[PDB]
Amino acid sequence: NFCVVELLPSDPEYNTVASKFNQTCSHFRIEKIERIQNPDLWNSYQAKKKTMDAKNGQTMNEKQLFHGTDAGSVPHVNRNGFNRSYAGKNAVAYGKGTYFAVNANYSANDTYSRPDANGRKHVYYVRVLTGIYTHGNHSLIVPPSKNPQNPTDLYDTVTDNVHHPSLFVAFYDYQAYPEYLITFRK
Ligand SMILES: O=c1[nH]c(CS[C@H]2CC[C@H](O)CC2)nc2cc(NC3CCCC3)cc(F)c12
């Protein structure tokens, strides 16, 4: 269960999100930005953030990233977040989880934010608990262990490039909160 508030171009949140989107997608046309309010998903996410904060020390565990999807997946995502059934439909090259882009222009590709019948594209601005990350590979359904001494001490997410990331993979729904849906067109 969830609700969705459309933000007005005059609200600080709209402008914050638009600004970040527009850093690589200015030449596209924003039609609306919606804030997604899903209590259970948000409660689960904040619980995961508390334990991750008390584990990774000084690490800034949270990044805001982009996720392009088809119109048909918006209801499933607003309702159950980036759950396993959704990840099944994501790429594999860096593991079997949900894929998130540092730059909007990556997520805006038609391959990901597929234009619907009316030419409308959908990209989420997502809160993701990236935590401590390592290089991903095709065989992962969860991040590797850091050490063999402790095989239950896992990296929090994986990436294409640890020092210069372009994307991150999350393997659990409670690691990614879809705060904002950007609806836009070419
Ligand atoms: O924004 C993205 N969204 C997505 C979801 S795809 C979408 C297609 C329609 C289905 O119903 C729902 C899933 N995947 C990504 C992957 C990326 N990279 C991988 C690709 C090739 C190896 C790495 C970079 C991305 F930005 C993104």
Question: What does the H/E/C string look like for the chain?
Answer: CCEEEEECCCCHHHHHHHHHHHHHHCCCEEEEEEEEECHHHHHHHHHHHHHHHCCCCCCCCEEEEEEEECHHHHHHHHHHCCCHHHHHCCCCCCCCCEEEECCHHHHCCCCCCCCCCCCCEEEEEEEEECCCEEECCCCCCCCCECCCCCCCCECCEEECCCCCCCEEEECCHHHEEEEEEEEEEC
55 lines ligand 1 (CB under 6 A): no
**Residues 50/129, Cβ–Cβ less than 8 Å:** no
Strands 133-135 and 157-159: parallel
Which amino acid type is present at position 89?
K
At 150, list the tokens. 């402790």
Which amino acid, residue 93? Answer: A
Describe the strand order of the beta sheet including 121-129 as a list of residue ranges.
Answer: 3-7, 29-37, 176-185, 121-129, 62-69, 98-101, 167-170, 157-159, 133-135
- Whole-angstrom distance, CA of residue 75 vs CA of residue 119: 18
Residue with the smallest CA separation from ligand 1 atom 18 is: 99
Atom of ligand 1 nearest to the CA of 69: 7
Residue nearest to atom 20 of ligand 1 (CA): 91
Record the tokens describing residue 45, joined without a space.
Answer: 């996410």
Dist CA 30 CA 125 (whole Å) = 13
Rounded to whole angstroms, the Cα distance separating 126 from 101 reads 10
Question: Contact 64/142 with Cβ under 8 angstroms?
Answer: no
- Is 122 exposed, middle or buried, given 0-12, 13-18 or 19+ CB atoms closer than 10 A? buried
Cross-strand bridge partners of residue 139: none
Measured distance CA(38)–CA(40) in Å, rounded? 6
Whether the CB of 99 sits within 6 Å of ligand 1 = yes
Beta carbon of 70 within 6 Å of any ligand 1 atom:
yes
CA distance 13 to 175: 22
Closest ligand 1 atom to the C-alpha of 67? 1
Q: Please indicate whether residue 130, judged by its CB atom, sits closer than 6 Å to ligand 1.
A: no
Nearest CA residue ID for atom 8, ligand 1: 112
Structure tokens at 115: 């234009």
Experimental method: X-ray
Q: Which tokens belong to 29? A: 């046309």
Q: Do the beta carbons of residue 135 and residue 164 sit within 8 Å?
A: no
Query: Buried (b) or exposed (e) across 157-175, using 16+ Cβ within 10 A?
Result: bbbbeeeebebbbbbbbbb
Whether residue 124 contacts residue 21, with contact meaning beta carbons closer than 8 Å, is answered with no
